[PDB]
Design a protein around this ligand. Sequence first.
Ligand SMILES: O/N=C\c1cc(-c2ccc(O)cc2)ccc1O
Ligand SMILES: O/N=C\c1cc(-c2ccc(O)cc2)ccc1O
Lengths: 9, 9, 235, 228
Amino acid sequence: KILHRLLQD
Amino acid sequence: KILHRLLQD
Amino acid sequence: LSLTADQMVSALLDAEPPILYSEYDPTRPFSEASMMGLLTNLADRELVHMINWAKRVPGFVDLTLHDQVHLLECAWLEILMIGLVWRSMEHPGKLLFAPNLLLDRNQGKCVEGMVEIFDMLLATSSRFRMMNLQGEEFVCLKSIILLNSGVYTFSLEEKDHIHRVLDKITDTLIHLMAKAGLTLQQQHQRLAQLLLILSHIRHMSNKGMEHLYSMKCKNVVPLSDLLLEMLDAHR
Amino acid sequence: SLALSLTADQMVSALLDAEPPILYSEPFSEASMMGLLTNLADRELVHMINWAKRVPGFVDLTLHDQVHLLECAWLEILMIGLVWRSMEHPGKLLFAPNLLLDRNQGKCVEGMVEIFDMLLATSSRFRMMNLQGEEFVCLKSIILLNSGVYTKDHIHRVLDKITDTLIHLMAKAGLTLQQQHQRLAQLLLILSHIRHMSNKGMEHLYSMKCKNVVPLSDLLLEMLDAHR
Ligand SMILES: O/N=C\c1cc(-c2ccc(O)cc2)ccc1O
Ligand SMILES: O/N=C\c1cc(-c2ccc(O)cc2)ccc1O
């Protein structure tokens, strides 16, 4: 889940 | 064109 | 158009298509072929009433025959689904396809890829229940879908006429909220809430349209001659 | 929350200050065109995700809800932004300042010309309505919060807050009460067509994936798995 990583910087 | 026929009543 | 707000609602409410029945037999259990046969048979008969309902939508007969075909080809499943969502409003957790056809979210699993569409239709009906959607606003939204979902895929005077008819239904919606006792801020919000559900209905239609093409290729249950012509319009 | 206590003028400034940048491209054959658009969209998603956190009230949600809303709206947000850039370029789509394509250039991809016509008609609609940048940032934040909400009460309270800011923009522009809610309806009805372009564009990407016209990034692949 790349989106999870980018949402919390 | 059934729709065109039913619209042409 | 010269129809006032109160006359706009009366014309739309007077043009309301009937609530057709299905040949469902409560003795016969459900299957993917049994269920898809009932839904497509029901959707095929509701089409012929919608085609005659569209003619009664104020301003729709002023358009050319070719434009009338375009608006219906693109928004037909949107109109069917919002009518379904409106009937299931007072039946939470179920979809009232026909007065003798109440389907559950679990019953919708008998067809592959159908459970996900049941949730959105259920959630949309739950949304109408939260807002407590009135019939005067439902007939306005359903006529908006007819004149809006296909006006962009277009003559400039005909598009001009549609934009004037759409502005009339908008004022009609604001008029109903005003007489209902909503403040000037609440009328704008409810108007916005009512128009954002039209985005989800377009989504349900797309996935519903996309689902109908899968059954055609799987050839689970044969589709009607009229229902197949609408399907080739999208894909 | 913080978004709820904001002012209509303060809400607009918070959205304008969070505007993502206009990125540049790296338009002849099929695979070369799909490669430029998927490469452009993958870099735009990174800014959009950070743009989402700066949207007032979006960070108040849980992480899973932030994932959901972005997964069902990312192509809508990518398209309404593209439609906004292409506003001063009638008949052409401004994917990037160096990637400006017209109607016939989209024919180089199987089925892309159909999405081009819908995208051009939307930009022509924004041009006809003379859409303002303050209204554009409101419409974009509505899509982020509304496209995934029926799949909660805080989102609808933030959506109503954005509606008041939209009316606030038209009111200070000189439009009468009738002109205000008439233009309000015209903007929100476009969101139905933008959702349509996203769905038909979502199947095009999934079609390009199964045809393997160009490799897709892992991020863009994840956003494509949330549909179908
Ligand atoms: O696609 N196959 C079946 C299907 C049918 C409907 C439907 C909706 C409303 C209605 O009045 C009648 C039928 C909705 C969603 C569907 O997936
Ligand atoms: O579907 N495959 C590719 C595709 C990509 C885009 C697109 C749109 C906007 C944008 O900023 C970046 C990319 C738009 C439409 C498309 O059909």
